[PDB]
UniProtKB/Swiss-Prot annotation:
This is Zinc finger protein 473. It comes from the Eukaryota. Belongs to the krueppel C2H2-type zinc-finger protein family. Interacts with the SLBP/pre-mRNA complex but not with SLBP alone. Interacts with LSM11 in a U7 snRNP-dependent manner. A zinc finger (C2H2-type) spans 13-35. Involved in histone 3'-end pre-mRNA processing by associating with U7 snRNP and interacting with SLBP/pre-mRNA complex. Increases histone 3'-end pre-mRNA processing but has no effect on U7 snRNP levels, when overexpressed. Required for cell cycle progression from G1 to S phases. The gene is ZNF473. The C2H2-type zinc finger 2 to 6 are necessary and sufficient for discrete Cajal bodies localization. The C2H2-type zinc finger 5 to 10 are necessary and sufficient for interaction with LSM11. The C2H2-type zinc finger 2 to 8 are necessary for interaction with the SLBP/RNA complex in the histone pre-mRNAs. The C2H2-type zinc finger 2 to 10 confer activity in histone pre-mRNA processing. It is found in: Nucleus.
């Protein structure tokens, strides 16, 4: 046989909440701001 081997690793931060890939890590962190919400008023 000797087919070979698999397994690669390429730096890439992507939001696993919506589905958006970014270049840096600070760009994604500033995006999760819209994801997180707050609780208080019932009506909402
Ligand atoms: Zn997102």
């Amino acid at each position: 046989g000797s087919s070979g081997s698999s397994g690669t690793d390429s730096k890439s931060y992507n939001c696993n909440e919506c589905g958006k890939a970014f270049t840096r890590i600070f760009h994604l962190t500033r995006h999760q701001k819209i994801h997180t919400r707050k609780s208080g008023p019932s009506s909402g």
